[PDB]
Coordinates of C-alpha atoms in Angstrom, one line a residue:
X2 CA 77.9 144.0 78.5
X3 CA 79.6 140.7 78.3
X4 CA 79.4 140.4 82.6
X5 CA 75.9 141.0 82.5
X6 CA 75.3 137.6 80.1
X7 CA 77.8 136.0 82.4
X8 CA 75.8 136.7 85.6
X9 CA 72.3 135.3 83.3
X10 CA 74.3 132.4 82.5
X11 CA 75.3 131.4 86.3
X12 CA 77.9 134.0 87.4
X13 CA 80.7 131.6 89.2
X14 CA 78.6 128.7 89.1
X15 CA 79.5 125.3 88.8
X16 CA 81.1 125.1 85.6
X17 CA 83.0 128.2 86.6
X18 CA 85.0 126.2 89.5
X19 CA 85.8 123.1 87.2
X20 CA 87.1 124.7 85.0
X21 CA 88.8 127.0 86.5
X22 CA 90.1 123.7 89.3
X23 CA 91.4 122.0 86.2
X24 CA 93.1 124.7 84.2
X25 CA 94.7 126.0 87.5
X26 CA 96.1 122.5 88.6
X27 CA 99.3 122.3 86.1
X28 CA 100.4 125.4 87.7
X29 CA 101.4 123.4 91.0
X30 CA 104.0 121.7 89.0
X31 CA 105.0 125.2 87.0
X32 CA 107.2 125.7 90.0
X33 CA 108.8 122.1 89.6
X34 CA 109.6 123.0 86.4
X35 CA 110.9 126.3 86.3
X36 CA 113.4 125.9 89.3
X37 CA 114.1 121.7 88.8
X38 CA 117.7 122.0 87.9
X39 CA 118.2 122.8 91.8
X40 CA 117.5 119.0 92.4
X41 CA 118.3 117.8 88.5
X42 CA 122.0 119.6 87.9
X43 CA 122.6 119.6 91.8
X44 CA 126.5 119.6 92.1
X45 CA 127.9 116.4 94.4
X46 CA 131.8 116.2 95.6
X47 CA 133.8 115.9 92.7
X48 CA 137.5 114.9 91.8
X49 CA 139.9 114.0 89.5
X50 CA 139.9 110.3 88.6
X51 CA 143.6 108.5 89.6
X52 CA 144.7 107.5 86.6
X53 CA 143.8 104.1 85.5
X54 CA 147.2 102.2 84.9
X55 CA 148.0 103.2 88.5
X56 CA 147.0 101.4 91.6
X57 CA 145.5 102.8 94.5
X61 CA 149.2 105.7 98.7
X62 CA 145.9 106.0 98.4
X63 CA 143.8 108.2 96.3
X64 CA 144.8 111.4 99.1
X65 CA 148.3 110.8 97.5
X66 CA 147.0 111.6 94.2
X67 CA 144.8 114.7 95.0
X68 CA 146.3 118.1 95.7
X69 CA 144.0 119.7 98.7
X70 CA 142.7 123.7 99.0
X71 CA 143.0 126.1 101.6
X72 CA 140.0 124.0 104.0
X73 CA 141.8 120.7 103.6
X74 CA 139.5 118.9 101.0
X75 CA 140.6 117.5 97.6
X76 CA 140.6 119.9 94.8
X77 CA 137.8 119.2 92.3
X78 CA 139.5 120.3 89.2
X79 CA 143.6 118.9 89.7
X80 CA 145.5 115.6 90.4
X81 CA 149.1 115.5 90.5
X82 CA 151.2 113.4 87.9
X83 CA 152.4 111.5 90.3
X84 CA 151.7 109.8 93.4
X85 CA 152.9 111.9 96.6
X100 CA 154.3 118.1 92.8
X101 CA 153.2 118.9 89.2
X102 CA 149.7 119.5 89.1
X103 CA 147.2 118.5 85.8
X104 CA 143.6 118.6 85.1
X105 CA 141.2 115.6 85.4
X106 CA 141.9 113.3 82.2
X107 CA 140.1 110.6 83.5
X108 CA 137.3 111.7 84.7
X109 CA 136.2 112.8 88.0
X110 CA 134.9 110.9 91.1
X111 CA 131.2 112.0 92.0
X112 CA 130.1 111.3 95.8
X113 CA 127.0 109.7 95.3
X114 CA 125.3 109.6 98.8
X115 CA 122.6 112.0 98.4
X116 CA 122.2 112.7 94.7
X117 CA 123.1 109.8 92.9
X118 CA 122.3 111.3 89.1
X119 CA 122.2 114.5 87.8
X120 CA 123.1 116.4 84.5
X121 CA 126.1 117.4 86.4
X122 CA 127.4 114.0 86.6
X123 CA 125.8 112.8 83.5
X124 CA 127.8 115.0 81.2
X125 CA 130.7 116.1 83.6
X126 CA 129.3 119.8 83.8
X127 CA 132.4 120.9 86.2
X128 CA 135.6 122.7 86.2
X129 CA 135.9 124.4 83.0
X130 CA 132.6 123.2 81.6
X131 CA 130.5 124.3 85.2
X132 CA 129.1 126.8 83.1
X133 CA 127.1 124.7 81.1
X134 CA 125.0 124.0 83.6
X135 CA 124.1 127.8 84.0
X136 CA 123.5 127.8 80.4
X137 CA 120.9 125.4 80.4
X138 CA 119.0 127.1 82.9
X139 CA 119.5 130.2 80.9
X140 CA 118.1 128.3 77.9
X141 CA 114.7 126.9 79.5
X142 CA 114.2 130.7 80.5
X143 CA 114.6 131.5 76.4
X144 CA 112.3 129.0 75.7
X145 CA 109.8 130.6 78.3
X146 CA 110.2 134.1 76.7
X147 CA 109.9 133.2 73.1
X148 CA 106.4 131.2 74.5
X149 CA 105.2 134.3 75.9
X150 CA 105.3 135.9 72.6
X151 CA 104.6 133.1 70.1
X152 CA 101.8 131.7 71.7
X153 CA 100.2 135.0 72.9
X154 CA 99.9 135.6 70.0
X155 CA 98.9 131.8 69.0
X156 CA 96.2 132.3 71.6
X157 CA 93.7 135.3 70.1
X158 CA 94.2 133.6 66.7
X159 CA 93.2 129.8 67.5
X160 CA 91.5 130.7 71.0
X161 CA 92.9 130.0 74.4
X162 CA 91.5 126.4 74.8
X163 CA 93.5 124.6 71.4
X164 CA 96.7 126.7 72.6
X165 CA 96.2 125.2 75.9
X166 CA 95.4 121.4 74.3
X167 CA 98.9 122.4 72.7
X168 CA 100.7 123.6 75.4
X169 CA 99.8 120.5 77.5
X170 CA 100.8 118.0 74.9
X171 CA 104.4 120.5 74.2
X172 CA 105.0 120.4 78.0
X173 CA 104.5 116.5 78.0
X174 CA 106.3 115.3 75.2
X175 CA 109.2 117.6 75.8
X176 CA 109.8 117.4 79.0
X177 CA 109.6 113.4 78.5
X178 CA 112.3 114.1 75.5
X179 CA 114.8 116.0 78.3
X180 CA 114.3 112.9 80.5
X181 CA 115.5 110.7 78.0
X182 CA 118.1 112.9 76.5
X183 CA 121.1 111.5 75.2
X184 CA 123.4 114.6 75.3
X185 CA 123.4 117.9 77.1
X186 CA 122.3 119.3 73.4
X187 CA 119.6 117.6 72.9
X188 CA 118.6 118.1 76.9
X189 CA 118.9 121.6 76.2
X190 CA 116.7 121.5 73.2
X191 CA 113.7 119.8 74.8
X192 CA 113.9 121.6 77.9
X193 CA 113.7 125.3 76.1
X194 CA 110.9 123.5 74.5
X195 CA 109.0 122.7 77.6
X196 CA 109.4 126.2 79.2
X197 CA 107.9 127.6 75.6
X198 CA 104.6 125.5 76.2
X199 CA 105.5 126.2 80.3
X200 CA 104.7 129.9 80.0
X201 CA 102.0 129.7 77.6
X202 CA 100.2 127.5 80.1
X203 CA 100.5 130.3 83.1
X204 CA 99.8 132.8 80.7
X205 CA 96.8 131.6 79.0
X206 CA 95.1 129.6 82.1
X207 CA 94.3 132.9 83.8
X208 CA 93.6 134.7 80.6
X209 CA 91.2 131.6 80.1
X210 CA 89.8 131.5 83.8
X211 CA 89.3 135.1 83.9
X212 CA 87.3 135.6 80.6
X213 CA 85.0 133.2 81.9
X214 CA 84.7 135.1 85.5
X215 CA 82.6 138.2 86.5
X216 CA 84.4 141.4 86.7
X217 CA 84.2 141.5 90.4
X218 CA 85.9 138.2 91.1
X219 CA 88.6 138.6 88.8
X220 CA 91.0 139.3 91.3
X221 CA 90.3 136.3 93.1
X222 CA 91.3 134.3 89.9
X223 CA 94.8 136.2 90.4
X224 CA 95.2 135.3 93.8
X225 CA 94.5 131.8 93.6
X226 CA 97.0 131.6 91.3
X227 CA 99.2 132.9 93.9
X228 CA 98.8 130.4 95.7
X229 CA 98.6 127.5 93.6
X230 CA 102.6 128.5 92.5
X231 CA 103.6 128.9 96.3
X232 CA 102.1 125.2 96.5
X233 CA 104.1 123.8 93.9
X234 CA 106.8 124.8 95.4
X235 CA 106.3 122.3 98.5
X236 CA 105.0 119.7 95.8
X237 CA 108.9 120.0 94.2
X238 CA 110.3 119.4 97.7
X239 CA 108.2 116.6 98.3
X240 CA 109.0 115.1 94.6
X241 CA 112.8 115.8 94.3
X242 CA 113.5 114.3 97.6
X243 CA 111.3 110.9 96.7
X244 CA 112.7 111.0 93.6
X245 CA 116.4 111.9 93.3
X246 CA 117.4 110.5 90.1
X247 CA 117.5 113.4 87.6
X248 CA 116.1 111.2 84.6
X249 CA 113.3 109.4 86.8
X250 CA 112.2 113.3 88.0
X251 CA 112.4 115.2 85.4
X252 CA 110.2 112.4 83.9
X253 CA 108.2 112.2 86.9
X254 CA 107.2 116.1 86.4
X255 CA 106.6 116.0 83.2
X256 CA 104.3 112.9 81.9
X257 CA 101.6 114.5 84.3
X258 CA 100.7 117.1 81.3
X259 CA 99.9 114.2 79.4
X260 CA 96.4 113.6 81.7
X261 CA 95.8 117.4 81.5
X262 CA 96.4 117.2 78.0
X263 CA 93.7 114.5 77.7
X264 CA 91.0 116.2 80.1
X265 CA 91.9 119.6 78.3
X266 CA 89.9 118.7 75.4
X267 CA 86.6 119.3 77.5
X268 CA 87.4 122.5 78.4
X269 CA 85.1 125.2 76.9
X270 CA 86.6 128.2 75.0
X271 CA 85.8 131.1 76.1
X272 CA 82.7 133.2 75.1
X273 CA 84.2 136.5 75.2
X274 CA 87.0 135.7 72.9
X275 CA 84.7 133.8 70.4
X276 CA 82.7 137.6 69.9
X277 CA 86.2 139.2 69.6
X278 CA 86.4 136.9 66.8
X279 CA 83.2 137.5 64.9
X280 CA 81.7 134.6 66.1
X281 CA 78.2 135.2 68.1
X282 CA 76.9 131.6 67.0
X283 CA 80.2 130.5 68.8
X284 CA 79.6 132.8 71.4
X285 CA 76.1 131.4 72.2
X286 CA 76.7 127.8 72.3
X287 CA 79.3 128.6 74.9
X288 CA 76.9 130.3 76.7
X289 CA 74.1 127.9 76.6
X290 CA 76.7 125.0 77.1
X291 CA 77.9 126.9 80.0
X292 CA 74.0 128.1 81.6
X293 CA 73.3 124.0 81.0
X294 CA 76.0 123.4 83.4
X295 CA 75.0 126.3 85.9
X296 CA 71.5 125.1 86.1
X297 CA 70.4 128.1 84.6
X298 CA 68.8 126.7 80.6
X299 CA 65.8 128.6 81.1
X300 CA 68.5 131.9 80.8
X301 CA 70.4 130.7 78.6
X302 CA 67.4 129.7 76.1
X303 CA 66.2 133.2 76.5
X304 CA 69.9 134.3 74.8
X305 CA 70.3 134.7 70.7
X306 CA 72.2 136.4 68.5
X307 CA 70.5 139.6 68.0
X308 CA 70.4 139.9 72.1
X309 CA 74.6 138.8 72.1
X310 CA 74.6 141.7 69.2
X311 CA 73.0 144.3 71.4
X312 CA 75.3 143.1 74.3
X313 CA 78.5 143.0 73.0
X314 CA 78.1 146.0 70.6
X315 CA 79.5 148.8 72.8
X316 CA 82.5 146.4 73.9
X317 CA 83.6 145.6 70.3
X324 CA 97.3 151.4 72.2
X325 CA 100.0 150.2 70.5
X326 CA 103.5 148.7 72.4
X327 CA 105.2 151.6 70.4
X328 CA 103.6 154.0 71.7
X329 CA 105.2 153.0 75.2
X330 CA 108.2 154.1 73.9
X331 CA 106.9 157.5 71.6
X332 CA 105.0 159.1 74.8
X333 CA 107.2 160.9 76.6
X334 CA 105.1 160.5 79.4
X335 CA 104.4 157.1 78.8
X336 CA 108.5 156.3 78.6
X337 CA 109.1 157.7 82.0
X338 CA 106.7 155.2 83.4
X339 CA 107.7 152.1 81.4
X340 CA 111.3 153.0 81.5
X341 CA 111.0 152.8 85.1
X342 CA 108.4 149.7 85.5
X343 CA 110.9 147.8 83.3
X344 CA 113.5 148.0 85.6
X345 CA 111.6 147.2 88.4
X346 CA 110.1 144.2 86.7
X347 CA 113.6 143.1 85.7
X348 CA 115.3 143.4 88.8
X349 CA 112.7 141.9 90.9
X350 CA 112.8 138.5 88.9
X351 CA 116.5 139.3 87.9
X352 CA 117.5 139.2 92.0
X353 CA 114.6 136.4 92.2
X354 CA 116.3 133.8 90.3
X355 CA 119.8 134.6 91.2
X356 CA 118.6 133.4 94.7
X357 CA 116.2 130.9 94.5
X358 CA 118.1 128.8 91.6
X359 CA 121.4 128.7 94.3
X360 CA 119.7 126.5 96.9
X361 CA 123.0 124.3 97.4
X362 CA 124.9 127.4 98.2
X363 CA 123.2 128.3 101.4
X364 CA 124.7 125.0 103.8
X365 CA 121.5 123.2 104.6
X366 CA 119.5 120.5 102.8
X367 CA 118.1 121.9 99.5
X368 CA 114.8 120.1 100.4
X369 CA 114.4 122.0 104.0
X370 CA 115.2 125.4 102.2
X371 CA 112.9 124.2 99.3
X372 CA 109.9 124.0 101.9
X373 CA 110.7 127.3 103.9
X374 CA 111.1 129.1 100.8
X375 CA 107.6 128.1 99.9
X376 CA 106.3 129.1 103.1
X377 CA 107.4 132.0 103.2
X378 CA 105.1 133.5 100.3
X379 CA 102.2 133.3 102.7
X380 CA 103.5 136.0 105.1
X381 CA 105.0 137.8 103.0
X382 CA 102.1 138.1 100.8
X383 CA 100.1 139.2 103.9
X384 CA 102.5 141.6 104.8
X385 CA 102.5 143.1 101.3
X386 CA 98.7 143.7 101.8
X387 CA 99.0 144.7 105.2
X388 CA 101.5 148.0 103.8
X389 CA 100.6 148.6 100.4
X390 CA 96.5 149.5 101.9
X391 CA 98.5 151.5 104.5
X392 CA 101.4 153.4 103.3
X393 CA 101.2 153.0 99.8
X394 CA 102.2 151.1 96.8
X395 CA 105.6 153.3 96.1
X396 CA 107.3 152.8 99.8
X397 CA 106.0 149.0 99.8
X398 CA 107.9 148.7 96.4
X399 CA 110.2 150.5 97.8
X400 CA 110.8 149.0 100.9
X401 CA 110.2 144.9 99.5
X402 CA 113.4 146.0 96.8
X403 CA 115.9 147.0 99.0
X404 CA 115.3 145.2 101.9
X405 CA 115.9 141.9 99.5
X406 CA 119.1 143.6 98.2
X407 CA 120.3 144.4 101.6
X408 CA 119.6 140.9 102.6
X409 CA 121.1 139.6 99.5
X410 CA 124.0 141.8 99.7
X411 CA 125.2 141.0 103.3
X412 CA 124.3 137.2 102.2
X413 CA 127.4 137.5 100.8
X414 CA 129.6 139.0 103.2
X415 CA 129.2 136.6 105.6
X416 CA 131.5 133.4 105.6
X417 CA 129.5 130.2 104.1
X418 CA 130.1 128.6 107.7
X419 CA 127.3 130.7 109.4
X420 CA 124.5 128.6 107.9
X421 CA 121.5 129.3 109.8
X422 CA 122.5 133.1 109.9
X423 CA 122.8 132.8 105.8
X424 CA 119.5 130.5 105.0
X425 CA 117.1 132.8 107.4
X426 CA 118.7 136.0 105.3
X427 CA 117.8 134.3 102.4
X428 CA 114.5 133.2 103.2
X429 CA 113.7 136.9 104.2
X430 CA 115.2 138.2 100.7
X431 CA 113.2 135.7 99.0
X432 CA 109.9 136.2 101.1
X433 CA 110.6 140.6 100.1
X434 CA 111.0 139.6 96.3
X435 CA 107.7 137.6 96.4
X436 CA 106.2 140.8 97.9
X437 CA 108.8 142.8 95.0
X438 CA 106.8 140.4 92.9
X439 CA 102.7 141.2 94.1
X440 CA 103.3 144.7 94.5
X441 CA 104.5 145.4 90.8
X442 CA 102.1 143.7 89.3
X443 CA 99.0 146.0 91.0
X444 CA 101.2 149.1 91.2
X445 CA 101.7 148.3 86.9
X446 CA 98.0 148.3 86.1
X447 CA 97.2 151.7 88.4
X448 CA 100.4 153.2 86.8
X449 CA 99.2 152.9 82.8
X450 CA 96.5 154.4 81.5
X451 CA 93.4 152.0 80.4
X452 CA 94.3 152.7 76.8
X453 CA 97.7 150.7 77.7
X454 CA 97.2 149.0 80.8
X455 CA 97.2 145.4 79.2
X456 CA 100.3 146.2 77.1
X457 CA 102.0 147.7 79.8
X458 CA 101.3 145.0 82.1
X459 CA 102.5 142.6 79.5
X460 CA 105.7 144.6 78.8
X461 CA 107.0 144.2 82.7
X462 CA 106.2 140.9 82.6
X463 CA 108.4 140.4 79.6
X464 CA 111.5 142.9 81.6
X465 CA 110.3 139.8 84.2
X466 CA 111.3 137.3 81.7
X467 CA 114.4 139.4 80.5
X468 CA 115.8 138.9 84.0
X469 CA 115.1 135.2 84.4
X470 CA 117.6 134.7 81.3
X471 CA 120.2 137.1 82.3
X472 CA 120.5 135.7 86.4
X473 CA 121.9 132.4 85.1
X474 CA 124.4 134.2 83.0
X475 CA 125.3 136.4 85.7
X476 CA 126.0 133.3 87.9
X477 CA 128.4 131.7 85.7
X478 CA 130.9 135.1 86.8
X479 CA 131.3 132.7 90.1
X480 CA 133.6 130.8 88.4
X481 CA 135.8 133.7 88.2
X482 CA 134.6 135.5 91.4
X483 CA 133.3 133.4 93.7
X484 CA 131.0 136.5 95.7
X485 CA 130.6 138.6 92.5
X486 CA 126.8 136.7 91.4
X487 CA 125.6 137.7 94.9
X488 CA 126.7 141.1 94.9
X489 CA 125.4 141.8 91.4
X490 CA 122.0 140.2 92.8
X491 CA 121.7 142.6 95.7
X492 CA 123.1 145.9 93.9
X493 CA 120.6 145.4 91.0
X494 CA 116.9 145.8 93.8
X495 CA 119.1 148.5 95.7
X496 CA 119.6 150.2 92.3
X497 CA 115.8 149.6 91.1
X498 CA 114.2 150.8 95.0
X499 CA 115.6 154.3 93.8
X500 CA 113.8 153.9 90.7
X501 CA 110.6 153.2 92.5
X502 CA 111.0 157.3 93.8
X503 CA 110.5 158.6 90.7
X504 CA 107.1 157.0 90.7
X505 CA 104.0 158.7 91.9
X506 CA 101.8 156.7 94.5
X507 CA 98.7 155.5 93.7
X508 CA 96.8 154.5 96.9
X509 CA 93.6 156.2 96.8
X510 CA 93.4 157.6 93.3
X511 CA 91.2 156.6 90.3
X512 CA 92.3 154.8 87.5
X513 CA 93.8 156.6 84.4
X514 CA 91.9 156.2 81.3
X515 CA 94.1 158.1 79.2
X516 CA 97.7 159.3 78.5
X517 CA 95.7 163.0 79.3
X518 CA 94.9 161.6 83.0
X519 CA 98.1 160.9 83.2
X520 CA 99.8 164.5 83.1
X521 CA 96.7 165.7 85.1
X522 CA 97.4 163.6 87.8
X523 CA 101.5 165.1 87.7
X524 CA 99.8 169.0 87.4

């Protein structure tokens, strides 16, 4: 077996933790990336621009006000103070806490607010279409040039959106860096692990966990040094260019070299790797005909997800649970301005609240079970979603601390689906199953900006359709069986054992 040359060659020895260290450490700014249009198309005060021939009544003579007193954002009057008109001029952006951002770069209010949604919605595309591409980029050119790839991508396209001209071309490059974006979360723990014994995979899983709950401080810290959406966007980018440089010293992994026919491959990496581990006198002692010997033993289709009836049931269900997990996930953590207090408070307390609810996650899933923590993480986040809002915007603290506990209950949405996946499918399809949900994952991502552009029509109607959605999907989780203190399937025949 492959884990048996890995433990000769060092188990998680030294090369094992720099590698690992440096493949793991653009996920901090994954994070930054993923949710930055919080802090790069934040929305300022806005209003129409008094027309320019006239001379400043005053500007409140010019501005018709709503229902709480303030200036309308969208509508002037034609004359100075009642016949109302749009804003020909321009607007008027308040510029004491964010001075720059798409917003007011390319006037994404009033009738073209939406555009800002659809940019968002856009960077999620490009993160989809990476999963696929470059999964499948990765088994044909190995995991380490993909990676060299992706870092270089995320670099020069993110760069590209800082220096944008147009919201097009902004667009462009930033579906562009979520492409290389998801390809680098996907293939550093598909890297990382390959090169880990079997018994410490999961650790490689958790620290990954953590590394994305830290970048989410690291964007709080960033955004609020760096306001200026061109300087931060920048600022979060031009980092991949150094991993991109060190990236060419990683080491491909030996497994997927054998996978590809390659045992002389395969045993450089493992000598290379035992010279590094202190172990050369194993590593000499390793050749092709004992990789051959090794390996021999070791060396379903998506389709059949949907052919199985008893495999539908399962991935019919997972999918929606997978979708409305990240569907309700984005829809709250991409509407930070929304909530009353300053974006980069809420930024920190909805990073620290992955730790607990993480722990918590553990602490029920080992007791009750997998399907009532699922259960229980879903519509608790709706509930708290749903009543979110209900209540009127001027109940702040009430509002953020609902939030933070919907947010910290999708996080545990978010670790509990993952494990409850892989103990659902069989081992034939365990892999393609868990790569299907995390597709549905990336489904919903795309479709919770869309569904927040409805705001402009109904103001409440995003946050409802955020909190019905888990509320709907913690009914699917009952048709699941629990799997706390069962084996693992191995086949699609296990599976209707396990229902007899």
């Amino acid at each position: 077996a492959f884990n048996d040359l890995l433990k000769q060659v060092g188990g998680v020895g030294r090369f094992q933790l720099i590698q690992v260290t440096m493949v793991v450490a653009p996920l901090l700014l994954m994070a930054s990336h993923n949710t930055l249009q919080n802090f790069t198309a934040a929305i300022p005060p806005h209003h129409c621009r008094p027309p320019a021939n006239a001379n400043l009544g005053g500007l409140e003579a010019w501005l018709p006000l709503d229902k709480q007193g303030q200036p309308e954002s969208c509508l002037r009057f034609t004359s100075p103070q009642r016949v109302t008109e749009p804003c020909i001029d321009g607007w008027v952006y308040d510029n004491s806490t964010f001075p720059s951002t798409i917003v007011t770069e390319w006037n994404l209010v009033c009738s073209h607010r939406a555009f800002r949604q659809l940019a968002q919605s856009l960077y999620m595309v490009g993160v989809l279409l990476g999963a696929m591409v470059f999964g499948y980029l990765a088994d044909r050119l190995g995991r380490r040039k993909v990676l060299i790839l992706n870092y270089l991508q995320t670099a020069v396209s993110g760069t590209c959106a800082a220096y944008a001209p147009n919201y097009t071309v902004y667009c462009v490059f930033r579906l562009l860096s979520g492409m290389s974006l998801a390809s680098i979360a996907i293939n550093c723990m598909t890297l990382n692990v390959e090169w880990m014994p079997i018994h410490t995979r999961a650790y490689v899983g958790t620290l990954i966990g953590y590394v994305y709950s830290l970048g989410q401080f690291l964007l709080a810290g960033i955004a609020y040094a760096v306001p200026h959406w061109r300087h931060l966007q920048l600022v979060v980018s031009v980092p991949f260019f150094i991993a991109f440089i060190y990236s060419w010293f990683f080491i491909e992994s030996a497994r997927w070299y054998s996978s590809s026919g390659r045992l002389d491959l395969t045993l450089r990496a493992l000598q290379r790797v035992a010279r590094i581990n202190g172990k050369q006198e194993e590593g000499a002692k390793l050749s092709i005909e004992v990789l051959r010997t090794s390996l021999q033993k070791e060396l379903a289709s998506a389709m059949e997800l949907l052919r199985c009836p008893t495999l539908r049931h399962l991935f019919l269900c997972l999918s929606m649970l997978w979708f409305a997990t990240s569907f309700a996930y984005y829809g709250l953590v991409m509407d930070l301005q929304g909530f009353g207090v300053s974006m980069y408070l809420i930024q920190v307390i909805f990073g620290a609240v992955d730790l607990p609810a993480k722990f918590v996650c553990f602490l029920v899933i080992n007791s009750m079970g997998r399907r009532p923590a699922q259960m229980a993480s879903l519509l608790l986040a709706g509930i708290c979603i749903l009543v979110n809002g209900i209540i009127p915007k001027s109940h702040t603290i009430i509002r953020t601390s609902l939030a933070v506990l919907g947010k910290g209950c999708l996080a545990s949405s978010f670790n509990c689906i993952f494990l409850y996946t892989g103990e659902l499918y069989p081992t034939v399809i365990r892999q393609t199953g868990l790569g299907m949900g995390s597709t549905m994952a990336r489904v919903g991502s795309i479709v919770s900006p869309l569904v927040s552009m409805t705001a402009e029509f109904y103001p409440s109607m995003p946050l409802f359709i955020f909190g019905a959605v888990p509320v709907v999907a913690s009914a699917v989780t009952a048709l699941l069986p629990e799997t706390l203190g069962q084996p693992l399937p191995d086949t699609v025949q296990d599976l209707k054992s396990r229902s007899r």
